[PDB]
Write an enzyme that holds these catalytic residues in place. Structure first.
Site: not given
Ligand SMILES: Nc1ncnc2c1ncn2[C@@H]1O[C@H](COP(=O)(O)OP(=O)(O)O)[C@@H](O)[C@H]1O
Ligand SMILES: [Mg+2]
Ligand SMILES: Nc1ncnc2c1ncn2[C@@H]1O[C@H](COP(=O)(O)OP(=O)(O)O)[C@@H](O)[C@H]1O
Ligand SMILES: Nc1ncnc2c1ncn2[C@@H]1O[C@H](COP(=O)(O)OP(=O)(O)O)[C@@H](O)[C@H]1O
Ligand SMILES: [Mg+2]
Ligand SMILES: [Mg+2]
Lengths: 124, 77, 41, 519
Positions: D53, D86-87, D387
């Site tokens: 996170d 948040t990232t 989340d």
């Molecule tokens: N199965 C998946 N395939 C492709 N992209 C994904 C998948 N799951 C999540 N994402 C991408 O990863 C990002 C989420 O990453 P995450 O670690 O939650 O960062 P944040 O907390 O900033 O959202 C989203 O922008 C989403 O588009």
């Molecule tokens: Mg996320």
């Protein structure tokens, strides 16, 4: 610090920290490997005051030890949990966790993605 | 040369400028500015994930192109 | 040796829980790719 | 020749802030996406934390640079407003600042950069809204897919099959889906209990309590009538200083006897209502449950749970329809709660839990029991489930859906490049910088997946130019594809708030030109 990241601490990243974690887990498992099976042998433990403890119980050994690394505290707590939920296997579970870590880090060094290693472990 | 540098890359840049002075006797500031700019752009290229050797090879290619263009647009006195 | 005829038995729950817990531990440790150790105060 | 700019410390401060922010962004860039990994953080006290996170990571690493602190606050604000992203928000902020670097060097004023960034932000909100599609809260499959997408990035992703339906059920159980405009996730209680594995997590519609039962022998109660007791079952005590002066030998026995009789009358008035489960609030300054009271309750066959906290009272009432009673006179049957079962369950020698399941008045409250083999993995499972709940909350707030896999960022890069080409001037450079800055999320997703970031992002840009605006990075196939076929969807609110908050933080940091050391 010296790097742009101004965090007031040390930072390990990548194969460095992965190898370190595996080293810690292996250390913990090598402590207890010699106490496994009908031919395993017991251990003395001296508590810095002359307090002596003879034991073959892996959970007992890892509770009495003073562990500093978090990746090794994880395995110590794992042995504790095995002792709470089952009551036997406290050494085998640690040995198996460490060996899984070893092979999984070998794969990650061969650049199989850790997510893929984790999915494969879950399936297996 | 008067600069009391401790960083080894700054030492390399001092050597670069000294080399320009030895060979030419002018340009000792242009060489440093240009090298710094090349590395600053390599920074963004590395962020995008290109191999630093690929960056160096593209820089060599562009440098050859620029050298030939200099030979082309040159004048004589 | 045939351990079922030799009498070397373990409860199924032992091996099952051992495997599940070991896998969970391996997964949690393997998920780590960075470490920030803050200087104590 | 314009203004000499006799001072260079403003520029030095701007560049230092930009560098610190970019350093934070690049430090947490590895924890982005389904192929991103977690960071371990050992506090100065030695508290270990494994997490993916961004808000947690940034709050836990005691960053020291002012700009890094501001990025921490930015990630916290994103965690508040959306609970997901948040990232991405921190990465976007760091990238926008990294572009301000070259803009400043080109010789643009920070005010012009700020205004052009605001323009690009408004245009990008427009673009994302155009991309968005509406969603009905009845679309349980869409909700499941949003939750699964939110969970794909976390350590709990092999258990997504288990934790996505729970994360959707909880929110759909704690809101009226027809009128709800938001959700209070304090209505969803999370109970972390060591032991078992994360596949042992449960969604309890009733109530769960960690407080232990005081009776021995009475652990299970069927057809349970439950009462909350905010008064103390012990010897009488006036709010004023009180004593009982004994001057004769008879008065001692009389005192003991009348105390017994007081307690017995209390417990008899309790039993007379049909109450068989008794939740007693925690009482400092006075004994809430004397040994006599416990004896009498046990003899009357009443399960007793004391030490309930003054903050769990509203939750327990909301859950099991009880009404808190503070005077024995008002303790009647209409002040009780009916539950089909109340049992003290043991968790394989890993502790005990009181589960009050079944309710005649189950009012918009649910509990999630989080199991796990380690404290660290339990904490990260809790964070990930939170989340997912916040993703569903975003969906409830704003009924709009956006594709994932870096598709919105790529569409933003593209259309804002076009906007820049149309906005000829010095704003053109700044808008093009905004676009190339928004191009960093796909690059990061590709890098983490293990692909060639340049080729992958160019293929994405090309397909989005062709028109596949729902095209993203398929980490399962290993390249580009329609990401809705992989079911990667996220609420529009996440991306919109991320962009807005990152842009506001960037303008704030650009409005800074000096640093003072107070005292
Ligand atoms: N199965 C998946 N395939 C492709 N992209 C994904 C998948 N799951 C999540 N994402 C991408 O990863 C990002 C989420 O990453 P995450 O670690 O939650 O960062 P944040 O907390 O900033 O959202 C989203 O922008 C989403 O588009
Ligand atoms: Mg996320
Ligand atoms: N008589 C036996 N012959 C062969 N193997 C045995 C025998 N008894 C125990 N073992 C093996 O020893 C392993 C664990 O031994 P021990 O150290 O006593 O248990 P724990 O794992 O609880 O520490 C088990 O995997 C079991 O298969
Ligand atoms: N009168 C001028 N008008 C415009 N440009 C000039 C003039 N004189 C020098 N320059 C430029 O300034 C640049 C820097 O050269 P300079 O700094 O003087 O020498 P060095 O680079 O060797 O220290 C050169 O590339 C040159 O083209
Ligand atoms: Mg044994
Ligand atoms: Mg000159």
């Amino acid at each position: 610090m010296e790097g742009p990241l101004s965090v007031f601490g040390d930072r390990s990243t990548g194969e460095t920290i992965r190898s370190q974690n595996v080293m810690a887990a292996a250390s913990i498992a090598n402590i207890v490997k010699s106490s496994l099976g009908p031919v395993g042998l017991d251990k003395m433990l001296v508590d810095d005051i002359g307090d002596v403890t003879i034991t073959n119980d892996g959970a007992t050994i890892l509770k009495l030890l003073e562990v500093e690394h978090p990746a090794a505290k994880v395995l110590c707590e794992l042995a504790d949990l095995q002792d709470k939920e089952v009551g036997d296997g406290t050494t085998s579970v640690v040995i198996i966790a460490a060996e899984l870590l070893k092979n999984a880090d070998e794969l990650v060094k061969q650049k199989i993605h850790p997510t893929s290693v984790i999915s494969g472990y879950r399936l297996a | 040369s008067m600069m009391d540098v401790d960083h080894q890359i700054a030492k390399l840049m001092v050597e670069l400028s000294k080399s320009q002075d030895d060979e030419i006797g002018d340009g000792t500031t242009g060489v440093v500015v240009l090298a710094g700019a090349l590395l600053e752009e390599a920074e963004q290229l590395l962020d995008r994930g290109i191999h630093p050797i690929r960056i160096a090879d593209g820089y060599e290619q562009a440098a050859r192109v620029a050298i030939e263009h200099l030979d082309k647009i040159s004048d004589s006195v | 040796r045939d351990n079922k005829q030799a009498g070397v038995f373990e409860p199924t729950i032992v091996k099952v829980k051992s495997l599940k817990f070991a896998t969970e531990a391996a997964i949690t440790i393997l998920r780590i790719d960075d470490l920030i150790k803050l200087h104590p105060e | 020749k314009g203004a000499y700019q006799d001072r260079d410390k403003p520029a030095q401060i701007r560049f230092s802030n930009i560098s610190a922010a970019k350093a934070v962004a690049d430090a947490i860039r590895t924890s982005l996406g389904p192929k991103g990994m977690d960071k371990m953080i050992q506090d100065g006290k030695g508290d270990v934390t494994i997490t993916n996170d961004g808000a947690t990571i940034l709050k836990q690493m005691q960053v020291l640079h002012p700009a890094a602190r501001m990025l921490v606050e930015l990630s916290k604000a994103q965690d508040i407003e959306a609970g997901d992203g948040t990232t991405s928000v921190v990465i976007i902020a760091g990238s926008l600042l990294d572009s301000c670097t070259k803009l400043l060097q080109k010789g643009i004023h920070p005010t012009i950069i700020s205004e052009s960034f605001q323009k690009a932000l408004e245009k990008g909100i427009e673009i994302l809204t155009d991309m968005s599609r509406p969603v009905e809260l009845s679309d349980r499959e869409t909700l499941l897919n949003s939750a699964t997408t939110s969970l794909n990035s976390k350590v709990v992703s092999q258990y997504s099959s288990l934790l996505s339906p729970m994360s959707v059920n909880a929110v759909m159980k704690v809101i009226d889906p027809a009128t709800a405009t938001s959700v209070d996730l304090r209505d969803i209680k999370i109970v972390k209990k060591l032991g078992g594995t994360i596949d042992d997590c449960e969604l309890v519609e009733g109530l769960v309590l960690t407080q232990k039962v005081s009776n021995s022998g009475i652990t299970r109660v069927e057809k349970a009538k439950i009462g909350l007791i905010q008064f103390c079952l012990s010897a009488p005590k006036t709010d004023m200083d009180n004593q009982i002066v004994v001057s004769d030998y008879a008065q001692m026995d009389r005192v003991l006897r009348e105390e017994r009789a007081y307690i017995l009358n209390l417990v008899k008035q309790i039993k007379k209502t049909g109450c068989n489960v008794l939740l007693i609030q925690k009482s400092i300054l006075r004994d809430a449950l004397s040994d006599l009271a416990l004896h009498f309750l046990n003899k009357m066959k009443i399960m007793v749970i004391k030490d309930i906290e003054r903050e769990d009272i509203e939750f327990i009432c909301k859950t099991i329809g009880t009404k808190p009673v503070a005077h024995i006179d008002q303790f009647t049957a209409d002040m009780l709660g009916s539950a089909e079962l109340a049992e003290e369950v043991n968790l394989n020698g890993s502790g005990k839990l009181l589960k009050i399941t079944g309710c005649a008045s189950p009012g918009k409250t649910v509990t999630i029991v989080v199991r796990g083999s380690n404290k660290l993995v339990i904490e990260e499972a809790e964070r990930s489930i939170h989340d997912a709940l916040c993703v569903i909350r975003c969906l409830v707030k704003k009924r709009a859906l956006i594709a994932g896999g870096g598709a919105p960022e790529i569409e933003l890069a593209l259309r804002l490049t076009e906007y820049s080409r149309t906005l000829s001037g010095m704003e053109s450079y700044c808008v093009r910088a905004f676009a190339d800055a928004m191009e960093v999320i796909p690059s990061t997703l590709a890098e983490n997946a293990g692909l060639n970031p340049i080729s992958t992002v160019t293929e994405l840009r090309n397909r989005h130019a062709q028109g596949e605006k729902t095209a993203g990075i398929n980490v399962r196939k290993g390249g580009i594809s329609n990401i809705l076929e992989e079911l990667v969807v996220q609420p529009l609110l996440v991306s919109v708030s991320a962009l807005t908050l990152a842009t506001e933080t960037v303008r704030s940091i650009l409005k800074i030109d000096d640093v003072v050391n107070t005292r």
